[PDB]
């Protein structure tokens, strides 16, 4: 907290949490663990939630977070993005075909949405 005040506006920037997910996949089998429906660690959902929950603007201070979301094989129905939507108030999605049209940027109007 600032003297005679609180914390400040916090700028946060995530770079492919998918990498963290991928590492969890990398380790699970060696951990004596089982293989999810695709091969992920079963614990992926809970660990993602644990990760996300320590990320919030509270009564104390404001924390602004930006997330890089790589999409494996460009698929939404993958478990990890699906879980991810349950975490993101601000959702922005890219497309390959839009870039195939040369439009830079290539954000899809539809799926990217906001509860604001």
């Amino acid at each position: 907290k600032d003297e005679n005040g609180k914390g400040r506006d916090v700028l946060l920037f995530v770079d492919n949490i998918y990498r963290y997910t991928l590492a969890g996949t990398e380790v699970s089998a060696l951990l004596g663990r089982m293989p999810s429906a695709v091969g992920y660690q079963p614990t992926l959902a809970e660990e993602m939630g644990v990760l996300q929950e320590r990320i919030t603007s509270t009564k104390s201070g404001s924390i602004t977070s930006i997330q890089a979301v790589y999409v494996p094989a460009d698929d939404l129905t993958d478990p990890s993005p699906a879980t991810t939507f349950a975490h993101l108030d601000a959702t922005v999605v890219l497309s390959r075909d839009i870039a195939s049209s040369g439009i830079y940027p290539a954000i899809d109007p539809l799926d990217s949405t906001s509860r604001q």
């Binding site: 695709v38 494996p72 094989a73 460009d74 698929d75 939404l76 129905t77 993958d78």
Partner: protein, 69 residues
């Protein structure tokens, strides 16, 4: 009429003997309208039906490509 050639530019020129070909001109008109009916049916019934049919669920399949599962 010319000393050797005659041309007859008739509006309705019909090989006939009596002014009673009404029984055959209507037949001609019915043939034409029936073939028009065939046109309107086969153009519509074949294509327009198939036009809708071939465009049924294309995007439904296009989205389920990128399914890696």
């Amino acid at each position: 009429v010319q000393p050797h050639v005659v041309t007859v530019l008739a509006d309705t020129a019909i090989r006939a003997d009596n002014l009673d070909e009404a029984a055959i001109l209507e037949a001609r008109k019915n043939a034409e309208q029936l073939l028009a009916n065939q046109k309107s049916d086969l153009d519509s019934a074949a294509a327009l039906a198939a036009l809708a049919e071939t465009a049924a669920q294309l995007e439904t399949i296009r989205k389920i490509k990128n399914r890696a599962q």
